[PDB]
DNA sequence: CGCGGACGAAGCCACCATGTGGGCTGTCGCCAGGC
DNA sequence: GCCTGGCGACAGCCCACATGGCATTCCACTTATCACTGGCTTCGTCCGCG
């Protein structure tokens, strides 16, 4: 009921995910600093590739009122009635008077304080609900402090609609706890197997018109980059994903699609300057029934270096997988797929020739 | 205590840059690299006698002597403040950009000892390029204590910078 | 008669005078707590007469005063409304308010060595070695250091607190000796607080005040241990002898 | 009869417990601050797991039901120490920004900037079980026997659920050591009163240091304690912890067998 | 590397005794600067760099002039004292020193015997065990060893100038 | 129509300070002669 | 049996450099974004559900 996927993936001078000052994010793990890619970033890349491949897209937005306003404006509403009707949409729901709004900005509809996370056709249905009650909205638009006229139950039922991404990663809405969905995926922070010092690159953007006398750079700075073999891990709680989608067939497509997205996608951080696109060097899908187990302790002792870390990382993940299957006995259906053929890696289960064959075999096994 | 050997190094070297070219040119070719690097083997004649006995202290001494000799000719030609006080002086007087130099200082304050050395020569030569004053002994002692301090010196650097910028702005009224 | 009790461990709390969600600890152990620790070691059920424990004396020297830290501590949050803490009327509160939020304090990295001198304290020491319930330092979640009893039987243990019990690493000046250590005795009284336990019955625990006099005393600087790991070494050398 | 169990379980980048603010909980111990996972949080997950696998032993092993009124046995006998890191740990800030999907005639006016704290390390866990009172209160030695065995397995298998979706901190302990003691329960926490230095890892070094502390305490007080330990490492012998076992459930089985 | 040093010292006293006592085996060692070295030095070995680091020093020790042959500081200080005491030129022995510090492991053995035999020719003390170990640490890490020699050298030369005044 | 659940009603109080470290290991030359 | 001594002949000395040089300009950014929730009392009324 737990599908967990491990992956070793090298990235060359990427710097895919930056902190607030531009340096790549780091964990001091095992006593040694190791650059990391935050989980929310790779999770965002996964949800956008899943939505793009499975066709249905969900929208995490702070500006729901403005978007409902374009739909009501395309339905034939005047701009002022479209704005008042979308304000009625967010005003009619929640415990207090309405969903709290950020301070009003000139010429634009105010953003909600919290980020809504709902599929696109559900936003259009909210526009239809505000549309049927056009005269009541017109009457409340004339008052100084209009109240939430729209039915709350209908709107709350639209805000409860779940996308595949909502089913998979969950959502949170503090004013409407009825809409909160438990996530079915645990996404770990991808850290390096080996210790990495932050590499500094010094670049100078060149002025193009020649100066008459003093030729110098137009601007000069230094951006930090790093490279290494990241360890990646993720869980999928099949009981919750089946509980969220309801039917096991959509959960099956959601899981297979998630695993493929996990392998295929890259966060795209300064990719136009580094081209860090890469396939994972090794992938290991286990289908466990008792509990998920990350192999991150296997790489707590940082690798020394001077030699290619890929073979030693794959072999070390192998030894830790072997030692855990001996220490914690289980009937979990294992399986792996690797690029290197220098080792058999016996503990990672049955070997499969390709990543899609592995994903199809383990999803079919669950 | 180390401040003593640091002041002896600052004096002799400060004289060395001006009087003898072959020595400073032997020093500047070792900016920003660990002393084991072969480009540094020519700098031992000048620096090795002055270091007591961790690599952190050696890296501090050797590196500050190298940055000291890599000053542009204009800078070399011409309470005890830190590099942060020198930063705030370069913001208020010489007119450096503020949002970027404060960002660069809070960028240095997170590195480890390995990273500070990587970042420091570009920043210090930037400061030195427009005649900003930097007391090298303090910077030496601080760079020696960066190795065993998680943030205990950097905090001093950041606090002094913000504080000196505020006082320099309030004195202009 | 008498034995040496060593209260050490990562965290220990000895609260007094707190009766709401926020809890607060005395910077030093409280007689109520230590007496209850012995009662727990001897199987004294809550509500049993506590006069056997009367007549004990607790001189406590503070090696490290320790840092006092406040541990957040919620109760019941994140549970469905039906499964949260009951009310006194009996009807569970709404789940957005069903969480209890206590802010319990505790001493961390603090070590005291109390020299309990009493009439039957030697049987009490023999009871800590084989307890009826687990002894703990204040809150049950805090678990005592294995060297809970440094010496089971000692004639005049305060004499051994003044000297010949090792001490944690502290500044030792050149040509120095006789490092200062604060002993706590039971006019010249530091504070007055409800300690002596009249009853441990959970329905109505009641207490009475005990004056405490803290006398900084001077013990030889030879006692303090070397900088690293030496404290554990000297202490172990100490337990066998 | 006291069955106590020590685990050296490490956790990657995670934030299992946090303060009234966002930062994780920390003990200042041995002079070096170190992150911790509070006892009640860890206990709640273990108790929930035991009650889920077991289908009133939960009021006996664990003192009382939180949502039930007191049934004259509020004491649980089980003692849970607060887990704390073997080494000193600095709090690691992770700056993050939620992205606004709807784009204005503006780029990157990100939805929400913030920064949350996380940390990673090797926590040294520990627990105790007062077996005799558990038998006297539960009645049947068999229910107690099953309950004790399942409680140890729950102590091993589980990890708290806190920020777990953002950090998959699910992990198994590297070392477990169950010592059926008749004198008194003892925690090996002082083995780490001096936080270990870094850059080479801590699992192995913490394993032999705890082996040194077990030799010394076993030396000062020789006891009839039945011991045994299982590790994910075969490279180093720890003779002071007792006979080695091939696995965790085999170990739990041998020590449950040893108590009765 | 502490264990490398113990064997270096036992080899040094064994080879020293063999050099002064027997000319046949000592001349058998001086020719290499090779089977006889394999039948002499071989027992005192714990990488190809440590073996060459032993056989090269045993042959160099066996090639000393009889003045030096009849009669812990490293080689940077040995050259500094060779400068200060014997009056041996410093400006040139510094260049020979930096020229040794640049070579790799096969070249250091190309430039070492000439300078060392020149040191022994002036009866300057050379701690043979440390020079052996340093040559063994050279295959492992060259830059650290070279810098240690250079720094120590310029450093002990300066201290000896303070002692002069 | 009855019961249960949720929400509401208040009382509410603001010119200048920082120093520390030390614990783990093994080796030959072989053969012959004499005591 | 243990300990000590021995196993053709295998070279020696002298010698080790001076001097000179070690660069200089210039250039160092902008914008937008920055959460919610609750951990008081009792009772009464209303609304929803059965």
Coordinates of C-alpha atoms in Angstrom, one line a residue, chain E:
Chain E
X1 CA 51.8 7.3 8.5
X2 CA 53.1 6.8 12.1
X3 CA 53.5 3.1 11.2
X4 CA 55.5 4.0 8.1
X5 CA 57.9 5.9 10.4
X6 CA 58.6 3.0 12.7
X7 CA 59.7 0.8 9.8
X8 CA 61.7 3.7 8.4
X9 CA 63.7 4.0 11.6
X10 CA 64.4 0.2 11.9
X11 CA 65.5 0.2 8.2
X12 CA 67.7 3.2 8.9
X13 CA 69.6 1.6 11.7
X14 CA 69.8 -1.7 9.9
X15 CA 71.2 -0.2 6.7
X16 CA 73.5 2.1 8.7
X17 CA 75.0 -0.9 10.4
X18 CA 75.2 -2.8 7.1
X19 CA 76.9 0.2 5.4
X20 CA 79.7 0.6 8.0
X21 CA 80.2 -3.2 8.6
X22 CA 80.1 -4.8 5.1
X23 CA 81.4 -3.2 1.9
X24 CA 80.0 -5.9 -0.3
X25 CA 76.3 -5.4 0.5
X26 CA 76.8 -1.7 0.9
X27 CA 78.3 -1.4 -2.6
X28 CA 75.5 -3.7 -3.6
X29 CA 73.1 -1.0 -2.5
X30 CA 75.1 2.0 -4.0
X31 CA 74.7 0.7 -7.5
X32 CA 71.0 1.5 -7.6
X33 CA 71.0 5.1 -6.4
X34 CA 68.8 -4.1 -8.2
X35 CA 68.3 -7.7 -6.9
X36 CA 70.5 -7.0 -3.9
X37 CA 68.3 -4.2 -2.7
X38 CA 65.4 -6.6 -3.0
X39 CA 67.3 -9.1 -0.7
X40 CA 68.2 -6.4 1.8
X41 CA 65.5 -3.7 2.1
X42 CA 62.6 -6.0 1.4
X43 CA 61.8 -7.1 5.0
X44 CA 61.4 -3.5 6.1
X45 CA 58.3 -2.7 4.1
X46 CA 54.6 -2.3 5.3
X47 CA 51.6 1.5 -3.4
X48 CA 54.7 1.6 -5.5
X49 CA 55.6 4.9 -3.9
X50 CA 56.4 3.6 -0.4
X51 CA 58.7 0.9 -1.8
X52 CA 60.6 3.3 -4.0
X53 CA 60.6 5.6 -1.0
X54 CA 62.5 2.9 0.8
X55 CA 64.9 1.6 -1.8
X56 CA 65.9 5.1 -3.0
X57 CA 66.8 6.3 0.5
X58 CA 68.6 3.1 1.3
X59 CA 70.7 3.5 -1.8
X60 CA 71.3 7.1 -1.2
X61 CA 72.4 6.4 2.4
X62 CA 74.7 3.8 1.0
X63 CA 76.3 6.2 -1.4
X64 CA 77.6 8.7 1.2
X65 CA 81.3 9.7 1.2
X66 CA 83.2 7.9 3.9
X67 CA 83.5 11.2 5.9
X68 CA 79.7 11.3 6.3
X69 CA 79.5 7.5 6.3
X70 CA 81.5 7.0 9.5
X71 CA 79.8 9.7 11.5
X72 CA 62.5 15.6 14.5
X73 CA 63.9 17.9 11.8
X74 CA 63.0 17.3 8.1
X75 CA 64.8 18.3 4.9
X76 CA 63.7 22.0 4.8
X77 CA 65.5 22.6 8.1
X78 CA 68.4 20.4 7.0
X79 CA 68.9 22.7 4.1
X80 CA 68.5 25.8 6.3
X81 CA 71.1 24.6 8.7
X82 CA 73.3 23.6 5.8
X83 CA 73.0 27.2 4.7
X84 CA 73.6 28.8 8.1
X85 CA 76.4 26.6 9.3
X86 CA 78.5 25.3 6.4
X87 CA 78.1 28.6 4.5
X88 CA 76.5 26.8 1.6
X89 CA 74.9 29.3 -0.7
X90 CA 71.3 30.1 0.1
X91 CA 70.2 31.7 -3.1
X92 CA 71.1 28.6 -5.1
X93 CA 70.0 26.0 -2.6
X94 CA 66.7 27.7 -2.5
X95 CA 66.3 27.3 -6.3
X96 CA 67.3 23.7 -6.0
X97 CA 64.7 23.4 -3.2
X98 CA 61.8 24.9 -5.3
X99 CA 62.9 22.8 -8.3
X100 CA 62.5 19.7 -6.1
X101 CA 59.1 21.0 -4.8
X102 CA 57.7 21.2 -8.3
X103 CA 58.4 17.6 -9.5
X104 CA 56.1 14.7 -9.3
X105 CA 56.9 11.4 -7.7
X106 CA 59.2 10.1 -10.4
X107 CA 61.1 13.4 -10.7
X108 CA 61.6 14.0 -7.0
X109 CA 63.7 10.9 -7.2
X110 CA 65.5 12.4 -10.2
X111 CA 66.6 15.5 -8.3
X112 CA 66.9 14.3 -4.7
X113 CA 70.1 12.2 -4.7
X114 CA 72.3 15.0 -6.0
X115 CA 71.2 17.5 -3.4
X116 CA 71.2 14.9 -0.6
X117 CA 74.6 13.6 -1.4
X118 CA 75.7 17.2 -1.5
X119 CA 74.3 17.6 2.0
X120 CA 76.1 14.6 3.3
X121 CA 79.3 15.8 1.6
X122 CA 79.1 18.8 4.0
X123 CA 78.2 16.6 7.0
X124 CA 74.8 18.1 7.6
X125 CA 72.4 16.0 9.6
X126 CA 69.6 14.4 7.6
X127 CA 66.9 12.5 9.6
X128 CA 66.7 9.6 7.2
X129 CA 63.4 8.2 8.7
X130 CA 61.5 11.4 8.1
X131 CA 62.9 11.9 4.6
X132 CA 61.8 8.3 3.9
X133 CA 58.3 8.8 5.2
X134 CA 58.1 12.1 3.4
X135 CA 58.9 10.4 0.2
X136 CA 56.3 7.9 1.0
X137 CA 53.7 10.5 1.7
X138 CA 54.7 12.0 -1.6
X139 CA 52.9 9.4 -3.7
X140 CA 49.9 10.0 -1.4
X141 CA 50.0 13.8 -1.3
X142 CA 52.8 15.8 -3.0
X143 CA 51.8 19.4 -2.4
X144 CA 51.5 19.1 1.3
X145 CA 55.0 17.6 1.7
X146 CA 56.6 20.1 -0.7
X147 CA 55.1 23.1 1.1
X148 CA 56.1 21.7 4.5
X149 CA 59.7 21.6 3.3
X150 CA 59.7 25.1 1.8
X151 CA 57.9 26.7 4.7
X152 CA 60.0 25.0 7.4
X153 CA 63.1 25.9 5.4
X154 CA 62.5 29.6 5.0
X155 CA 61.1 29.7 8.6
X156 CA 64.0 28.0 10.4
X157 CA 66.4 30.1 8.3
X158 CA 64.8 33.2 9.6
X159 CA 64.8 32.0 13.2
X160 CA 68.5 31.2 12.9
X161 CA 69.0 34.8 11.6
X162 CA 67.3 36.1 14.8
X163 CA 69.6 34.0 16.8
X164 CA 72.5 35.5 14.9
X165 CA 71.4 38.9 16.1

